[PDB]
Design a protein around this ligand. Structure first.
Ligand SMILES: C=C[C@@](C)(CCC=C(CF)CF)OP(=O)(O)OP(=O)(O)O
Ligand SMILES: C=C[C@@](C)(CCC=C(CF)CF)OP(=O)(O)OP(=O)(O)O
Ligand SMILES: [Mn+2]
Ligand SMILES: [Mn+2]
Ligand SMILES: [Mn+2]
Ligand SMILES: [Mn+2]
Ligand SMILES: [Mn+2]
Ligand SMILES: [Mn+2]
Lengths: 497, 497
């Protein structure tokens, strides 16, 4: 908790200034010209891979779209080239058959390859597998096992792919690591690299300015002073919101998300630590009524400021959207908050009854209590303009993509550890904790196949942009499972020059 | 409406800096030493008069208290000296008999005096008259008539006393005018004057900083953009709150008051101009319920943001006091807001029925609709720490001092002009508008006698500090009746050197 309010207010990055924003525009135009001159399809695919991994892809969206749309129209015997095209096309919603890998797979003896580069790209592409694509499953089985066996760069490349594949990491999180790798490359575009370093440093400056604003708001509520367990988690919460929506236009989305996660953290500590069962029933009822007079009349003292802070914050949230685009979402947003709170009470009742639920019964409640349903609702209302009534109702209908994404989120948090996923699974199968962890890791990978189908469904009310919020939340949980300061490195540490 | 958000943000007074605050402390100590050396009672009384009229009296409260407490223990044939002592002692709550003026009053022919200086001081003292003190009433009759008959400074002195006596003006409003008069004085204390100019300029800097903060809050709600009739009245509202509570420690009181008055102004325009009767019944009901879900469900579109802005603002107000001193005042503050709103609906129903009420029936509703009861409640909750439960309940009991102060406030606003006080009185007595205005001015002076009694009552739950909020609000209405830019001169125009 070193990065308190005073530290945040004292930051003064140079990259907020106007000179850098001029140079970035100059570089963007110069880069767009260089993209034109890449015409060979493999160079086109390697360019997109580099652009996405440098955190620059959102500047060149139509340019990337042309390249992929063109390659799809024309659609090797190269495993690297086949796997890279497969990954990129599936990532951006195009249909590619799993049968493109059939040439490298022998029916009797399985996959045949010795090239690490082709194996690494196939491993990345395997996470874009759909449900029931047995070639891709065997491809993952073959690639993971080969990668586990493992020149210094090959060892690190193999290590990173095993702990976190590209499909499971948000764009900006890998940006700093990949920026160095790109400057070590001999065939690097020098202007492309200079832009990657410049935009990365400018984003930090933007985030730091937002943190000052959010830091002052948190100080004004004074929950940290009132509640000794309300440790300042502001920077950690912003890290999550930043991974959910990193683009500069999503500043209001990151603000609502950061504050929401900070409040969620305090309320969660009240339910699964500090609150008695009778107190938790009153707080749940007060949230359900959404009546400030009732809450002040019946809540315990320590719960009052916590409820009122949440109450006013959400009502201000409803006011902001009402002013901005004349949309009333108060019923929706407080409904989602109640769902989270009710799932907390279910977990508290289980704990006091000493009831160990079956894993599936736990996951049914656990997918809501991990805030997946609430967070995607917050992200949609605070990050979309105009709000579409059809699209919001689809989220309120408990859709399948939210169902399975939240399950991965819940399973991933429990791996970092009331009884949770690991204890439920051990109790249910008799497996050891070590084995139980491996099976839970596998469930997440199998559930990502279900999620891949819903992303490709273009008949769903959810846009791809709305779906990215949900995936990035899940991706953020994968990332935070590896790292407990990387968050300090992401927000407060510029890249030199 | 020249002083918009952009003008307020661009101000950068030099007097916020630390050097001036050093010199002020040096001057305060040097002045306290000079006060010791004044020992003659008339010089002691003239010193207090100068200190109060320079806006410096709150720095030397115990020093003034000693002087008055000492003079009361020892308690001329000088009308000026008798009238000045009478005014100052009654102003600060000491008992002085009206019989101190009996020497200058002949039973058959009335008051005997030719000295303008003694007449001017008696005129000021006459406003501290109590109910039924026939000497003081005759003193006012004699002094006002003599003053009406009216060397350039005597004419201005006589003019100012007739339009606004000392008892009816807030301290800082007269400060700039009196500061010049004091520097023209030959026997001036030079350090006393330098302090008066310095504190006046420092207060402007403090107010300007508060205005920036309040200006940004008003911009964020966006009511001025939503409602074409919601003209920016922020600077005008702050002027009122500043006259209600000018001291630097009352920054939060001025903030809540300014925003409250800004919201009152918009809501008042909705009731007595723009809203239909059915719409006003829903808004009144929504305020009575204090239910955000109901309001969004049933209110017209244009009323929604106006209600929600008020709703969140008051709930944040309740939150701030709860965090600060663990006091719950939500029931009280929303009760006072409902009383104002209900009085608005009464006036709207009268207007649509074309019913001209009797003046007393109008004043019964009019004293609430002028916001007197609400404003004193806001001032107490936002300007007192700790809040006393006994003292608040006394305000909620509709006490007499609030009853008569609000009546003066209501009568004074109607003089600046649905049918109001002047039309009701004309309709009721057949008097002409010119005569009706004179009678209404007299009512206010007779009602100030009732208010003087309640101020002197030391058995009331209200402290003198709480009573000053109420009187300063009334005093502010007297001041704003004379001036429609004096408000610009008060806040944005420093005194040189
Ligand atoms: C300790 C924090 C949490 C709450 C996760 C924090 C990240 C969030 C992103 F949205 C919360 F919104 O883990 P947690 O174990 O305390 O949550 P849990 O009690 O249900 O298991
Ligand atoms: C035009 C403004 C008001 C409202 C007075 C503004 C000053 C205030 C100090 F507290 C309001 F809070 O006069 P007004 O004639 O419009 O009020 P009215 O309709 O009841 O007669
Ligand atoms: Mn927890
Ligand atoms: Mn929990
Ligand atoms: Mn957990
Ligand atoms: Mn009006
Ligand atoms: Mn009115
Ligand atoms: Mn009026």
């Amino acid at each position: 908790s070193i990065w308190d309010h005073d530290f945040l207010q004292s930051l003064n990055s140079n990259y907020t200034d106007e000179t850098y924003k001029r140079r970035a525009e100059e570089l963007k135009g110069k880069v767009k010209t260089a993209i034109k001159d890449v015409t060979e399809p493999l160079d086109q695919l390697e360019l997109i891979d580099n652009l996405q991994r440098l955190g620059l892809a959102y500047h060149f969206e139509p340019e990337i779209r042309n390249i992929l749309r063109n390659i799809h129209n024309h659609n090797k015997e190269n495993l690297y080239a086949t796997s890279l095209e497969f990954r990129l096309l599936r990532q951006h919603g195009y249909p590619v058959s799993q049968e493109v890998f059939s040439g490298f797979k022998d029916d009797k003896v399985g996959f045949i390859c010795d090239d690490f580069k082709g194996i690494l790209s196939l491993h990345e592409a395997s996470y874009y597998s759909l449900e029931g694509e047995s070639i891709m499953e065997e491809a993952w089985q073959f690639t993971s096992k080969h990668l586990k066996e493992m020149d210094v760069f090959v060892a690190e490349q193999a290590k990173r792919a095993l702990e976190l594949p590209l499909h499971w990491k948000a764009p900006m999180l890998e940006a700093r690591w990949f920026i160095h790798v790109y400057e070590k490359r001999e065939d690097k575009n020098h202007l492309l690299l200079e832009l990657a370093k410049l935009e990365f440093n400018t984003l930090q400056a933007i985030y730091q300015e937002e943190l000052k604003d959010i830091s002052g708001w948190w100080k004004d509520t004074g929950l940290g002073e009132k509640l000794s367990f309300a440790r300042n988690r502001l920077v950690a919460s912003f890290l999550w919101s930043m991974g959910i929506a990193f683009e500069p236009q999503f500043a209001y989305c990151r603000r609502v998300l950061t504050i929401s996660i900070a409040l969620i953290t305090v309320i969660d500590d009240i339910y699964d630590v500090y609150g008695t069962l009778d107190e938790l029933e009153i707080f749940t009822d007060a949230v359900a009524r959404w009546d400030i007079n009732y809450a002040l009349k019946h809540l315990p003292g320590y719960m009052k400021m916590c409820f009122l802070a949440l109450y006013n914050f959400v009502n201000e949230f409803a006011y902001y959207v009402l002013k901005q685009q004349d949309f009333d979402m108060l019923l929706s947003i407080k409904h989602a908050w109640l769902g989270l709170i009710q799932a907390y009470l279910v977990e508290a009742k289980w704990y006091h009854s000493k009831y160990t639920p079956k894993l599936e019964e736990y996951l049914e409640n656990g997918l809501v209590s991990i805030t997946g349903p609430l967070i995607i609702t917050i992200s949609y209302l605070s990050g979309t303009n105009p709000i579409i009534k059809k699209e919001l109702e689809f989220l309120e209908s408990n859709p399948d993509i939210v169902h399975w994404s939240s399950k991965i989120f819940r399973l991933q948090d429990d791996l970092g550890t009331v009884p949770k996923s690991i204890q439920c699974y051990m109790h249910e199968t008799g497996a050891s904790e070590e084995v139980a962890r491996e099976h839970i890791k596998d469930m997440m990978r199998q559930m990502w196949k279900k999620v891949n189908a819903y992303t490709a469904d273009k008949d769903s009310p959810l846009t791809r942009t709305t779906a990215e919020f949900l995936l990035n939340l899940v991706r953020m949980s994968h990332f935070m499972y590896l790292h407990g300061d990387v968050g300090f490195t992401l927000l407060f540490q510029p890249i030199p020059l």
